[PDB]
Amino acid sequence: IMQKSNKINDALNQHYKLNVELGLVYAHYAHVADDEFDMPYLGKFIQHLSEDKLGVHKEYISDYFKRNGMKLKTDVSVAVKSIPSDAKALIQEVYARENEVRDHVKAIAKLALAEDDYESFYFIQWYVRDGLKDLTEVDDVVKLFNSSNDKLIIEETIKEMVE
């Protein structure tokens, strides 16, 4: 009784992998935003997202598995082989990835209900809302680039968001 769902186990290991590799790409993007595009505050915004993906986003799954018998799998593979050409494109790529995270999370909630796994429906509840919150935070930045053509104006505006 209460035997863990292998489908849910797989999908949460997949999501664990996604957050690790995303966090590694964002750590690189954070470096580029500062060093190449001369936007250190944009860099700290993306670093904070990097530490988020590699922090609680992965630890919550780790900690959930210890409580329910699911097995953790560490299989990580990510290479940053090209970088967007400028800062706007850099944040827009981050947006496109965060929008995909929402879709992965939605598949997990759907599957949890399909598996009658209400503990896992509950756990994913945090990820459902962080999907929209993280995406909204990124969107608030993508936008600055369509409201000003001045890197330093945009930077001053980001400073009050990464406070």
Q: Which residues bind Cl ion (CB under 5 A)?
A: 79, 96, 99, 110-111, 114
The answer to whether residue 114 forms part of the interface with a copy of itself (CB under 8 A) is no
Per CB under 8 A, 155 contacts a copy of itself:
yes
Q: Looking at residue 125, what DSSP letter applies?
A: H
Burial 64-96 (b: 16+ CB within 10 A, else e): bbeebebeeeeeeeeeeeebbeebbebbbbbbe
Let me know: does 11 contact 69? Beta carbons within 8 Å.
no
Residue 40 backbone phi and psi in degrees, to 5: -65, -30
With CB cut-offs between 5 and 8 Å by kind, which of Cl ion, Fe ion, a copy of itself, none does residue 134 bind?
A: Fe ion
Question: Which letter does DSSP use for residue 72 in this model?
Answer: P
Cβ neighbours of residue 32 under 8 Å, at least 6 residues apart? 43, 83, 90
Q: Is 66 in the site for a copy of itself (CB under 8 A)?
A: yes
Residue 143 sits in the site that holds a copy of itself (CB under 8 A): yes
Q: Which of Cl ion, a copy of itself, Fe ion, none has residue 6 at its interface (CB below 5 to 8 Å by kind)?
A: none
Interface residues toward a copy of itself, by CB under 8 A: 1-2, 20-21, 24-25, 27-28, 31-32, 34-35, 38-40, 54, 58, 62, 65-68, 72-80, 99-100, 102-103, 105-106, 109-110, 113, 116, 118-119, 122, 125, 128-129, 131-132, 135-136, 140, 143-144, 146-157
